Each structure stands twice: as C-alpha cells, then as structure tokens.
Structure 1
C-alpha cells in the first residue's frame, strides 16, 4: 500500500456513503420536517449520528489499511 501526502480519510468516507442511504434519507426527512420550527429547540442530531455511525463502521478498517 502506497502512502501519500494528502488525506485518504475524506475519500474513503465518501466511498462508504452509498452504503448508508436509508440513514441519509431519514436525516434529510428530519431536516425538511423541522424547517418550520421557530422556537430554536429542534435539531436533527440523532439521525445525523446514525448516518455517521454507519459511515464510520464502514470506513474504519479501510483508513488504517491506507495508513502507516
């Protein structure tokens, strides 16, 4: 495995993104659902966490394969 000067982790994270499409759909549904909230007390942290947990679980062994 060759080692490069630029970061492979964003590219690997982009490559693992089609594997978690249902989580991204749920996050987008949350983001469009809370667009009418005026109280300032509505976020989308849970769906964001689910999506990024799926992406990290995909991408964890591939990053250290590219790292010395």
Structure 2
C-alpha cells in the first residue's frame, strides 16, 4: 500500500464512527442531561469512554495496515 505523509488515523477513526452510533447517542443524551448543572461535578466521562472504546476497537487493525 501507498504510505502518505498525512496522518491516516483521523480519517480511519472518522470512518469507524457510524459503527458506534448507539454509544454516541448515549453520550449526547448524557451531555444534554447535565447541561443545567451548577455544582461542577457532573461529567460524562464513562459514556465518552464507551464510545471511544468502540471506535478504537474498530480502527485498531486498520490503522497499522496503513503504516510501515
């Protein structure tokens, strides 16, 4: 395969993002539900981790296919 001077990883990560639409919906639901917070402790790190774990598991073997 042809190796590119530009970074292929953001494009591959964007490609796997339709495969994890459910986790993205859960994260956006969390982000909407803590919008009116005032205590500064509400966060959505767990659903964010779920979405990025799904995307990472998709994109991991396709990232090293494009690298020497």
Q: How many residues in Structure 1 have an aligned counterpart in Structure 2?
A: 68
Distance (Å, rounded) in 2 between the aligned partners of 1:14 and 1:41: 30
Q: How far apart are residue 53 of structure 1 and its match? A: 0.2
- Structure 1 runs of 4+ with >2 Å offset: none
Q: How far apart are residue 45 of structure 1 and its match? A: 0.1
Distance (Å, rounded) in 1 between the aligned partners of 2:15 and 2:41: 33
Please provide the CA RMSD for this pair: 0.3
User: Which structure is higher in helix share?
Assistant: 1
Distance (Å, rounded) in 2 between the aligned partners of 1:36 and 1:6: 40
TM-score by length of 1: 0.99
TM-score by length of 2: 0.99
Q: How far apart are residue 11 of structure 1 and its match? A: 0.0
